[PDB]
Design a protein around this ligand. Sequence first.
Ligand SMILES: OC[C@H]1O[C@@H](O[C@H]2[C@H](O)[C@@H](O)[C@H](O[C@H]3[C@H](O)[C@@H](O)[C@H](O[C@H]4[C@H](O)[C@@H](O)[C@H](O[C@H]5[C@H](O)[C@@H](O)[C@H](O)O[C@@H]5CO)O[C@@H]4CO)O[C@@H]3CO)O[C@@H]2CO)[C@H](O)[C@@H](O)[C@@H]1O
Ligand SMILES: O=c1ccn([C@@H]2O[C@H](COP(=O)(O)OP(=O)(O)O[C@H]3O[C@H](CO)[C@@H](O)[C@H](O)[C@H]3O)[C@@H](O)[C@H]2O)c(=O)[nH]1
Ligand SMILES: [Mg+2]
Lengths: 718, 90, 67
Amino acid sequence: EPLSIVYPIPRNKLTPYRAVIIMRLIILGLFFHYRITNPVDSAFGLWLTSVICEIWFAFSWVLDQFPKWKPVNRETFIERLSARYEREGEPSQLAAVDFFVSTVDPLKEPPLITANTVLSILAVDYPVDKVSCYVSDDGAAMLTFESLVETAEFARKWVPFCKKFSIEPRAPEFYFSQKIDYLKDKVQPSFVKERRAMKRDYEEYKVRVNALVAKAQKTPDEGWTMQDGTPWPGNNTRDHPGMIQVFLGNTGARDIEGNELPRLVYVSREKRPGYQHHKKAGAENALVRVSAVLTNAPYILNLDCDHYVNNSKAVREAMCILMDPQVGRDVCYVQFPQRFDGIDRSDRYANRNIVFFDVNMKGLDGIQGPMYVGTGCVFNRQALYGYGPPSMPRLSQLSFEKTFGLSPVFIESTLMENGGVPESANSSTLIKEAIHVIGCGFEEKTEWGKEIGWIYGSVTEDILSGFKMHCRGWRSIYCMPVRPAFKGSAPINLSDRLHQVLRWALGSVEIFFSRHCPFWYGYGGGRLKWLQRLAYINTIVYPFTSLPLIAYCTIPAVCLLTGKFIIPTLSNLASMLFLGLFISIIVTAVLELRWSGVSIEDLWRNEQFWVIGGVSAHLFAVFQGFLKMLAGVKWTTLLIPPTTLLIINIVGVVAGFSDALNKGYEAWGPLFGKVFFAFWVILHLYPFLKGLMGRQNRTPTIVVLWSVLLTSVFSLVW
Amino acid sequence: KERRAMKRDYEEYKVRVNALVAKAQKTPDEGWTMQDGTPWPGNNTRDHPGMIQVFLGNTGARDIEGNELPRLVYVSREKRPGYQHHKKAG
Amino acid sequence: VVAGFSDALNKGYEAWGPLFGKVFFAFWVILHLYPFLKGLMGRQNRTPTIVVLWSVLLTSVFSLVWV
Ligand SMILES: OC[C@H]1O[C@@H](O[C@H]2[C@H](O)[C@@H](O)[C@H](O[C@H]3[C@H](O)[C@@H](O)[C@H](O[C@H]4[C@H](O)[C@@H](O)[C@H](O[C@H]5[C@H](O)[C@@H](O)[C@H](O)O[C@@H]5CO)O[C@@H]4CO)O[C@@H]3CO)O[C@@H]2CO)[C@H](O)[C@@H](O)[C@@H]1O
Ligand SMILES: O=c1ccn([C@@H]2O[C@H](COP(=O)(O)OP(=O)(O)O[C@H]3O[C@H](CO)[C@@H](O)[C@H](O)[C@H]3O)[C@@H](O)[C@H]2O)c(=O)[nH]1
Ligand SMILES: [Mg+2]
């Protein structure tokens, strides 16, 4: 019996989708041929720009549509996994999972959300002897350490309450603050009595965390001192010896009933002046090394502080694909879509970004698998080390020493076929080794960052890290449980959203000019599907499509102002080509909507969000990347380019009416073509540039100004 | 003071009703059996002898204070194969 | 109705008003059964795409038949 079944599109919604895109190519090819024939539109310069710019979009669509070829849907069952592995005979044979939570500063991001995430991690519906949790704080702060201690104390009450009543979500902050009737399917007789006590307990706990957070607002002049009566080892944010501690472990705090709980490990890296420490890749690599020595597990799950587990069966759902003997043989990681809560019904800023996850990720899952996003991925431990998929021909102590590190325990740790303490040494030695294997200069002669684990370099290291793992023949899987199984927080204000988009664009640009560029990287040895390298090419060259986009957004104003002629008037042959072009985009979207399940509105918003993203963030990102590449922004500054097009288009397009109207006003329709084409650009970036800022909500009664002054300058001309 | 206790009791009752509903999702192979230790008279949806019972009547359960409550009568019609039974009018 | 306009525009477009009458009759019909019949499909309004879907259908038909 198969643990998971992978079925493609049911063939009723697939062939039409393939047949429309394949037809669109021929229509585009014929459309391009017709334009190239015409050599003149009263301005050779505009003709050169428009044809070149339009050609770029066609390649972008080609690089963007083929990856969506052959979408694949997957279904997973947990009962068979439990029946096959849990076994009434016992013991369970389920694989271990390690959770990584990364933090940087307690003040910038509240620790309550981090504490709620940690509580969610420990409540997974998985054997307690298997799952483990790791929390990493780049900036050693007493608030984070104390918050975990408080979180561990409250975990004694929270865990048994969650397990006995099987409540979901298991994060108290995101569970109690829910208006869904909590008495929906509960059958236990004493659910209400325990729930009322738990809600009282959580509120008391929430107060303690707030007191702890507010306490640390002022820093004592001498420095932080632990309760035992010793200084906190890290008193300087830029200098603190590596710290490792174990909380709520097997040998320690137990549950109120008397059971054990998943072990929580608090590890902080060692920072010293004069050394460069990477932001997230370094922390993840340190966690991987620590996890291997402390509790070597065959799978690693990475999560962010904001994100929390929403489905208690996520570990089982993730493990049913990875632990399947047949399909799980070659799987580097299992990607889970990131779903954001606390978002209005009308997602103005397209924060949920369902189009990418519900279209691209599902479509891209058909070739090899999705791309690493940064969270909700169950990485195979061997895959991170960079060995290569099993059942393949090809991917000494010195080689292991030069490939992994100097610590013999960690070197010997990876030799373990499954995972665990090799010779069950005393905890002190393992702790001492774990403290030693997080040295500041530990990764000096090693390949960490270069070819093993998380990859250093670009800001968006997640894309880079996934690319190298897939380059060695590994596969990834896409999971879409009925429940999200992973939820976090999305940006609320635009300043963070635009910075988020800019940061993604800058990282991709850095990848393009780095050695890890899909154009000339990974060709040697193959093992990468030719149809997936196109997706990587698309994912790395997408920012460059913005420069023609701004040019395409600039042609309507330049033409409509003086030239007023981009293409020759239709010769009774372009009408069908233009008609075929416009209809082609509509039909493909419907079929893509038909099988993907996304809503048309989100597609319009995503299409309406791509245009604004390209003009503003990518243009600066490409120029900044080009400037940085040559060398080796504010919310106000980021909005400068898009405003320029908004002003130029609106003044240009409207001025076209005035100058054209003062003219014979009989040779119009080209005005409509340029006006409508100008409307195309403005309508794409009008709702955001206006909506994203606006004053309060549309209805300003200020739109009359354009009518008057343009009717007044018209009156000045009329 | 009474309202808080009443809300707690109603929540407990709702939990009990939800448990009772969820328990009945899977029917036993032999058939439903009453608490006293006898089979439920109607084991077939299309065949069940007519049943009548009285709960919370004048002679029965009384209020906490000591007063009486309106009588409740649960009646299930008799259905047998080979006859046409109307949905609501009958 | 949208076809009517098209043909009505290709015609002499001078003896109209009967065109207005038929348009108003079709509009009385359409306004009555458009809200419930279409609003059931979509969240609040697919105007984001419906208007452009309908608008291009007019110009596209206005052009193709005009050829
Ligand atoms: O990368 C690291 C980072 O990724 C995050 O996920 C990102 C993802 O990486 C991005 O690729 C994605 O951006 C895609 C947009 O969603 C997508 O809509 C758009 O594709 C455009 C395309 O550029 C455009 O040419 C074409 O549209 C047509 C127009 O409508 C027409 O007007 C014009 O004439 O012709 C074109 C084509 O013929 O197709 C679409 C629609 O505009 O751009 C990207 C496509 O790859 O955003 C994601 C946001 O999450 C991830 O979340 C992070 O965790 C990670 O760090
Ligand atoms: O030196 C650091 C600084 C921050 N973090 C944390 O690791 C993640 C890095 O995120 P960051 O680069 O600071 O920007 P964010 O906007 O918080 O996160 C973006 O980048 C993540 C992947 O790196 C994505 O999961 C998010 O959706 C995306 O919003 C966050 O949890 C941070 O708190 C570190 O691990 N090391
Ligand atoms: Mg963020």
